Amino acid sequence: DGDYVEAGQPLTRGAIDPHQLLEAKGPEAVERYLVEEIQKVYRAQGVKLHDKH
Amino acid sequence: KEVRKVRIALASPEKIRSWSYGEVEKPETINYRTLKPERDGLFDERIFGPIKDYECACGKYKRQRFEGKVCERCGVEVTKSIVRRYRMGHIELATPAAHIWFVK
Amino acid sequence: MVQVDGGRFATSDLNDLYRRLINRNNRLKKLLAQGAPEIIIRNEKRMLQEAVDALLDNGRRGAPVTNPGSDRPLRSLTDILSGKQGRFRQNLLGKRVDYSGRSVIVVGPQLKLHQCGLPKRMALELFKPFLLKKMEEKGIAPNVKAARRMLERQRDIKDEVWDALEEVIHGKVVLLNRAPTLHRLGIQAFQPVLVEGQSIQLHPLVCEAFNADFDGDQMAVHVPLSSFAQAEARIQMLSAHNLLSPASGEPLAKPSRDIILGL
Amino acid sequence: ARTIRIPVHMVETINKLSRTARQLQQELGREPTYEEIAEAMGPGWDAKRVEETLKIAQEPVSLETPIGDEKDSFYGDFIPDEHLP
Amino acid sequence: SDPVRQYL
Amino acid sequence: ITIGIDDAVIPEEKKQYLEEADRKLLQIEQAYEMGFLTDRERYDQILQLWTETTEKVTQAVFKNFEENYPFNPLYVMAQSGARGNPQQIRQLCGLRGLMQKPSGETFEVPVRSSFREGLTVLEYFISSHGARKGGADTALRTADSGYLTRKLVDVTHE
Amino acid sequence: AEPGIDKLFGMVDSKYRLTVVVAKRAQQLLRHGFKNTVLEPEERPKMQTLEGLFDDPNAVTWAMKELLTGRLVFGENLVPEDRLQKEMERLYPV
Amino acid sequence: SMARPVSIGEAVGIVAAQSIGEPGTQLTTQGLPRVIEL
Amino acid sequence: LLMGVTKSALSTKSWLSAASFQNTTHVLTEAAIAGKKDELIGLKENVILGRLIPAGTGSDFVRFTQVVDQKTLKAIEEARKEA
Amino acid sequence: MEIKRFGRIREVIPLPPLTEIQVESYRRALQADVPPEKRENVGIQAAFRETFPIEELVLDFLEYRLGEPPFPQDECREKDLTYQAPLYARLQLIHKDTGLIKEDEVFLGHIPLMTEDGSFIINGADRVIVSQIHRSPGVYFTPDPARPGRYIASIIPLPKRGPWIDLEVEPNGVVSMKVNKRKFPLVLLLRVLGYDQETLARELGAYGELVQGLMDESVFAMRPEEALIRLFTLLRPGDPPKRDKAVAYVYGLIADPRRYDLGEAGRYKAEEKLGIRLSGRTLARFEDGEFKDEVFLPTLRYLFALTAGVPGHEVDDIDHLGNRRIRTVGELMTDQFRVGLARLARGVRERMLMGSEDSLTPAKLVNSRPLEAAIREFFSRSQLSQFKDETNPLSSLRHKRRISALGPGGLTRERAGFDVRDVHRTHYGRICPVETPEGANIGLITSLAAYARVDELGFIRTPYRRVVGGVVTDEVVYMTATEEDRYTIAQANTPLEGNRIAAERVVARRKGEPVIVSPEEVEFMDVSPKQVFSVNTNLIPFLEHDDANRALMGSNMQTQAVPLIRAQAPVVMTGLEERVVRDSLAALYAEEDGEVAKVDGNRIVVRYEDGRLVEYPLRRFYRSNQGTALDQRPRVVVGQRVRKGDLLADGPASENGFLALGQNVLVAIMPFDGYNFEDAIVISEELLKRDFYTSIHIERYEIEARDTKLGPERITRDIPHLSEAALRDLDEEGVVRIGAEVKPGDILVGRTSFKGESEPTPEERLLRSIFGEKARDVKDTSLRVPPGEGGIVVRTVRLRRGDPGVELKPGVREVVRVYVAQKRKLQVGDKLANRHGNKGVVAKILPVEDMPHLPDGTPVDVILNPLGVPSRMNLGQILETHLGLAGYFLGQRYISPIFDGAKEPEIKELLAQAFEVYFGKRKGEGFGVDKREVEVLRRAEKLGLVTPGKTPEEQLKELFLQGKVVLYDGRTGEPIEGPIVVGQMFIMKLYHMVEDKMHARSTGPYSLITQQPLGGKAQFGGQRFGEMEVWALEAYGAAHTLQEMLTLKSDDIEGRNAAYEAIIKGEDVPEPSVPESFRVLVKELQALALDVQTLDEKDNPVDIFEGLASK
RNA sequence: GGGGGG
DNA sequence: TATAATGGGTCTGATGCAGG
DNA sequence: CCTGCATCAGAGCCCAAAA
Ligand SMILES: [Mg+2]
Ligand SMILES: [Zn+2]
Secondary structure, rough: OOOOOOEEEEEEEOOHHHHHHHHHHOHHHHHHHHHHHHHHHHHHHOOOOOOOO | OOOOEEEEOOOOHHHHHHOOOEEEEOOOOOOOOOOOOOOOOOHHHHHHHOEOEOOOOOOOOHHHOOOEOOOOOOEOOOOOHHHHHOOOOOOOOOOOOOOOHHHH | OOOOOOOEEEEEEHHHHHHHHHHHHHHHHHHHHHHOHHHHHHHHHHHHHHHHHHOOOEEEEEEEOOOOOOOOOOOOOHHHHOOOOOOOHHHHHEEOOEEEEEEEEEEOOOOOOOEEEHHHHHHHHHHHHHHHHHHHHOOOOOHHHEEEEEEEEHOOOHHHHHHHHHHHOOOEEEEEEOOOOOOHHHHHEEEEEOOOOOOOOEHHHHHHHHOOOOOOOOEEEEEEOOHHHHHHHHHHHHHHHHOOOOOOOOOOOOOOOHHHOOO | OOOOOHHHHHHHHHHHHHEEEEEEHHOOOOOOOOHHHHOOOOOOOOOOHHHHHHHHHOOOOOOOOOOOOOOOEEEHHHHOOOOOO | EEEEEEHO | OOOOHHHHHOOHHHHHHHHHHEEEEEEEHHHHHOOOHHHHHHHHHHHHHHHHHOOOOOHHHHHHHHHOOOOOHHHHHHHHOOOHHHHHHHHHHOOOOEEEOOOOEEEOOOOOOOOOOOOHHHHHHHHHHHHOOOOOHHHHHHHHHHHHHHHHHHHHHO | OOOOHHHHHOOOOOOOHHHHHHHHHHHHHHOOOOOOOOOOOOOEEEEOOOOOOOOOOHHHHHHHHHHOOOOEEEEOOOOOOOHHHHHOOOOOOO | HHHHHHHHOOOOOHHHHHHHHHHHOOOOOOOOOHHEEE | OOHOOOOOOOOOOHHHHHHHHHOHHHHHHHHHOOOEEEEEOHHHHHHHHHHHHHOOOOOOOOOOEEEEEEHHHHHHHHHHHHH | EEEEEEEOOOOOOOOOOOOOOHHHHHHHHHHHOOOHHHHHOOOHHHHHHHHEEEOOOEEEEEEEEEEEOOOOOHHHHHHHHOOOOEEEEEEEEOOOOOOOEEEEEEEEEEEEEEOOOOOEEEOOEEEOOEEEEEEEOEEEEEEEOOOOOOOOEEEOOOOOOOOOOOEEEOOOOEEEEEOOOOOEHHHHHHHHOOOOOOOOOOHHOOHHHHHHHHHHHEEEEEEEOHHHHHHHHHHOHHHHHHHHHHHHHHHHHHHOOOOOOHHHHHHHHHHHHHHHOOOOOOEEEOOOEEEEEOOOHHHHHHHHOOOOOOOOOOOOOOOOOOOOEEEEEHHHHHHHHHHHHHHHHHHHHHHOOOOOOOOOHHHHHHOOOOOOOOHHHHHHEEEEEEEOOOOOOOHHHHHHHEEEOOOOOOOOOOOHHHHHHHHHHOOOOOOOOOOOOOOOOOOOEEOOOOOOOEEEOOOOOEEEEEOOOOEEEEEEEEOOOHHOOEEEOOOOOOOOEEEEEEEOOOOEEOOEEEEEHHHHOEEEEEHHHHOOOOOOOOHHHOOHHEEHHHHHHHHHHHEOOHHHHHHOOOOOEEOOHHHHHHOOOOOOOOOOOOOEEEOOOEEEEEEOOOOOEEEOOOOOOOOOOEEEEEOEEEOOOOOEEEEEEEEEEOOOEOOEEEEOOOOEEEEEEEOOOOOOOOOEEEEEEEEHOOOOOOOEEEEEEEEEEEOOOOOOOOOOOOOOOOHHHHOOOOOOEEEOOOOEEEEEEEEEEEEEEOOOOOOOOOEEEEEHHOOOOOOOOEEEEEEOOOOOOOHHHHEEEOOOOOOOOOOOOOOOEEEEEEEEEEOOOOOOOEEHHHHHHHOEEEEEEEOOHHHHHHOOOOOEEEEOOOOHHHHHEEEEHHHHHHHHHHHHHHHHEEEOOOOOOOHHHHHHHHHHHHHHHHHHHHOOOOOOOOOHHHHHHHHHHHOOOOOOOHHHHHHHHHHHHHOEEEOOOOOOEEEEOOOEEEEEEEEEEEEEOHHHOOEEEEOOEEEEOOEOOOOOOOOOOOOOEEEHHHHHHHHOOHHHHHHHHOOOOOOOOOHHHHHHHHHOOOOOOOOOOOOOOHHHHHHHHOOOOEEEEEEEOOOOEEEOOOOOOOO
């Protein structure tokens, strides 16, 4: 309670809707979210895969 | 010349006719005894080209010296039989019909 | 409409779809000239639409048109273009090809990294045109047509013909493929080493990229024909020139199984 | 009704040959030979003519007929092209 | 929607 | 390097870890019929005990190998990365561990046997459910993955 | 591995340019019967038959070796393409 | 794969699709469905 | 605008790419109405025509590179360096 | 040799007849051996009693009979005939108007007969009908996914015998009925049944929360007749709701015992679930002029009470094996029979309304064409009628016991999810948990468990022993899954003293949940471990030691084992390998006691006590569906005394009556120089020398000579322009001589065909007009050997037109069949497997001098890499090797039953007894411990393998008890630096052999429309380079290689023709042209009225047809 | 939307 | 060409629609 | 305006594939 939240900051725990995030925080924020949230999965399975792709 | 682009567009009934080498007037396919195509049917050589390379149907003109001739007796052009892969026919509908892609 | 082996006829479904249309058009022309009542012309006209509909996209609207005494929908123009079996994904973005073969793969520890074991009997077919030309230069046969006649019967093959093939394949590479081709290393280039026997010998180090084992896997062989294709294979596609994963950048051809165990 | 159109009178003969054989098979408890039908059809008919009539009566089969499995194989795929060199 | 039923 | 049946070494520590697991399990049963814990709570505590007992027996398997039989084939293949991983080796010399019901919930009863000891038909059957569920998962995934890949090629090909 | 493959990737800005130079050079050699080669008789790639040593028939092998020598020049807009063709067919018949 | 600057002309999108897809097989909203959801 | 790969793939300028992907009739009807011209920019378009793809040895960057030996090269420069 | 059997489990009943699921099902359907008056109403009989009487004249069914087969089984297989019986039916025509009665027996065609072993012969080929699992008819209640506190009642009948019904209770509170995808209020149907508000209130009412919610006043404002018309208007938008018309539709959907059939099992499940009794198999009746309800109200009653915790009401598990039943051969065939019968009935009514209503008999009224076609359709084209798997005897035994969840009435693709593929707790003892396909079909195709049998209702039952007090009776009860859930069932391996349970705590199951229980609580006990698994799984010794995923492969691959000329039974068996051979009906047994009169290669004649001289002919070198040789060999000698059931001949892949799927070889487990890599296998050339893993294979070749419009094809020895070298081995008529060796390219049958108007080209006329040979009337069409095929010609069959007994399909003069045999020695690329799922390709064959060998000089046979074991977790193969080591020196074979087997100490005792023979021989013969044996013992003692400080004999024995021996490398003579596991293993040669799979093509056949190469080895096909393969070439940037694939190596016609010409001329291949399949695409889009235009850079059209398509 | 191999 | 006969026998996600 | 709600178009590769 009484915390400062940027626009596009998750209040709930859960997956963010990329679209809500695109309107709130803009493209670079969405690109950041997608690449990391994908990599999260591959890493958990021991798959080294370069972010560039 | 070299192919740089591919365009796709709607076909007018005029153009569809610009393509066609003949109107298919009969549901016949090939003759049950001779097995040759039935005239004015779906396989007619008079429309779509000769079955044998540089040879007309009845066999008056059988070789390439007449490439481009249309036989008076049987009516078939003497060219490569490969054209049966190329030349289009057409059906003249009595009343117009909608193209289902543009409906459904 | 083609005669198959038995003298029987085989025909494309489009012919039946056209026949339905043609009948209905012709009947409509006849019904008009004879001044049928409006109820009859209306039924005919609506039937004509359905016939056009089945021809262009069958099943799209209404009951799919079927051949009599079969539940199989006739294959319309839309079906030909589209789907896994459609014209695009079957004959356009991929094709069956000439100069190709397949066999069971077997490990070939003795191979160098850029090599594969290739059954000589496979290589003779895959390179058959090359072999014919070379068979004329050393005279094993008077001309190209006669040389081909000698390979037709298997007992007519003399031993000089195998030496002829060795000359042909010199320095050339072949492509090995193991499906599923998940990444670009499902195909790699190898200089073939002719072997007696019916099996392809695969180098141990490339098994990981192919995900090949020897529990009965088979691989396909392809022959790049032109100087351009052959160059592409030897420089870009040769197994020894692709040692690192394009995905992680880590080494792909690396010790495994027995190799690690021994060291 | 036929992809290969047949003269109307000829279609009538074929149906007669069929009709006849069904009679012959119902008394005989088995398929008749060409000869049993040729006799049953009366004068003018030998076994050779019954066979030739049946060859003529054969309808073509679809190139798109599945080769069993029904998943990924068509009959037309097994037919070589004998025309083009 | 059923061409037979409509004609009937 | 070879593999004989004696090469899967049941650690002496196993019997101890099992003795510990059964006395612990009895205390959780008393708290159900004595009304200390719920039905959910009883099941949750049992799974936790057996997970940790499994881990214990694994370290014991690998410690007994490193210290007393460091060239054992299983150990050597596993450690070098030639073949095998800790969990597979644990099933050879240890216990097989907890198995899953056809649904998704885990059985309370584990498989105490190892492949060296051999299972009981009931243990074997209990284990079968999970094997099959994995097989169906894998089968249904390759289609989803395959489809996924084709979309990616189509969106990036240019 | 192709002999001196690392040095060949050194000579070009893009590996695909190497392949093109090699492939075109190999086509030049086959068409003219090798008589335009920049190699000297002891540098010629050789092939071991049952009879004995003969010239390597594989022109792609030849071309990569030639490239290593330095005697080949590669680039864009060096000469109208047709003009090149006649002068080479003049120097080395077919 | 060459541990060096990419050559002009390399078909990079395809390599991206192959690099991402190939591991898909071995992946167990904690697995592959999450990747597809993204 | 953010679209998933499927929607994005279907939206590309190239109608040959889109129609070979999925939703072929829809793709093809909208293209034919629009009178769309495929510029053959990407790979699928060129594969379908059997053309030399715009990648690898087909990239325009490396495609026209010429090779000539110093012996043949000089044997051309001298005739042209005159009137 | 001695056979030592382990295990303490006393198995009360033996396995049932293994094909009984097939034999008993069809015998039950046909009742051919039952006198008609005594036939029960089931199968064919029930079908007739369903289709008849036929109303308007009345055609009534009297009885049917089955004749004898026109041709015996062998004859049918020989002539490409179906093995079948003539069906006749006695029918009486009754005239409803007159009184007239004409009666006759009409011929309905033939019905196929099942052979003794449970298979069929359809057009000459042996076939099997696979049983089908499906949802049992009945009434089910499942929880509604939408409302976490509500339920849906579903009424499901037999497939195609009615609609599915759903009774959801909608959010508004009224109970809705869903039928044929349409929903309406259920109350409306209730009023049609003649129900009044009192009955629904009085019956139900207790749930004032639900009973009042079904009540809708507008519906009650009308008598049962008006409500019946009202519903029909809801159901058929456009049909005038005429009272006879509406009644007819509703009757046919609900009350008609012809269009709506609950099962017989459905009726029982309904009676049991709702606690009512059904007068028949329909949901309602038309009785005394109105409709009287049977099912609907009890189903509503069960649903409402379970919507509020009333005791005794539960949801149904739809995957429970009490609610899923099997449709066996008899039932499947009868459904198709019932369809064909109903179709014939359409014909009866249409003919009973035309051609004079008087001058008609039953023989003229009936056309059997619809019935014959329905039966022929089922047997020829059904998804459940499959080409028999007869690779080896076990193949067919397993095939007949397979269970499919697919087919007409079962899962589709997309359709089947997870619940169905899962192994349900009720699968225990009924459906095998191991034997299933890997991949897309996992869980859909399964195998009947060994002790399981399908009852008359179609539920799989499994045997259990009764337990009274603590005493186990010998009385066995076969239970369905539903009845089993009532009791507490002990494990089969629970200790016994005598007939008494000897343990104070036993391992048992209650509703599948494992539970520890005292002997006072024990109601039943498992018969055996064998009852949990399929027949293939039961053939895996030491199965308790194998991970299931590998055991699966072990099971399935035995199906693929090829019959070997030297085939032997495994040295470690499970004790089932005898029963499988006997039930398979491959071998040959004595009917009664007797004496052997004669023994031949071709036959065995036995003189019994009866005095009758019975001659049993032997099937010799017959070609099975998969081309493996089915061959029987005589095992007795003239004058041998035989008892009832004693062996006479061994079938294929059997040795002295035991299943022999492979050979017993001496194996060393150790890496070998990377020839062992990733499951590859190294073998000793000694195996070929002694003809181990050699198998005979026969391939069948066929050719027709037919009449053409150009003249007759003739099979002749005269073939134009061919040398005598090519024709040397052909007989007078143009057929290859029996016994000739034929190789690829050789002529098998000479044939000529008349040339088309291609009647030799003018180019060809002049050439021939030079060598003075006139161009011949006929061309050479002779049948030749395919690439890679060939062998010895063992048989020829010729069938002409105009020869006694033969008539071919119309137009065909003559058919020739040539049978070619091959002895296949094991070779590099052939695939081997053991019973535990270890499978691999032969990568290297070393000469005997390279094989690792024992100190005493014995070389090993197979070297298997140990890296295959740990990740796979199949250890049964390890114990199999150890027990196999003991057996090599003790000269014995073992029976170790599954889960009651040889355990480690027992194997150790046996291993000690072996060491004495492996060593004591040496110590006597005047040899001591070897120098190298000391070096290994030194290294072994560093490993903790041997006890330090013991004599070498003591230490070698310590290693031998661990199943390890000293092994010398034959390439050096030096020992392997460590002790290696060596022993006897059972390994099979599977049906996948390089000889069959190797294929290559330069150019060949092309497809009609696309002009791309055809597919497959038999067509001389090209390989498919598919989308993912193109991606590979794209990522490499190999543009010219890819373009070759897309043009010159496929459908670019100018290019592929030009390229071949270039290669044979030594030129480089030309730059490609337009692929023909693109032109096809263009023309097909024009056929869709779309204009596709190729443009240049200036946007002008480019003609890719080169003027051919423009006028 | 499909028996076998990878 | 002439009794009269008159109405049929699976599962998912995306997208564009009639409806509280 | 918004939300149910339906209608449609998707659902891995290559090889035997026993018609
Ligand atoms: Mg494999
Ligand atoms: Zn003419």
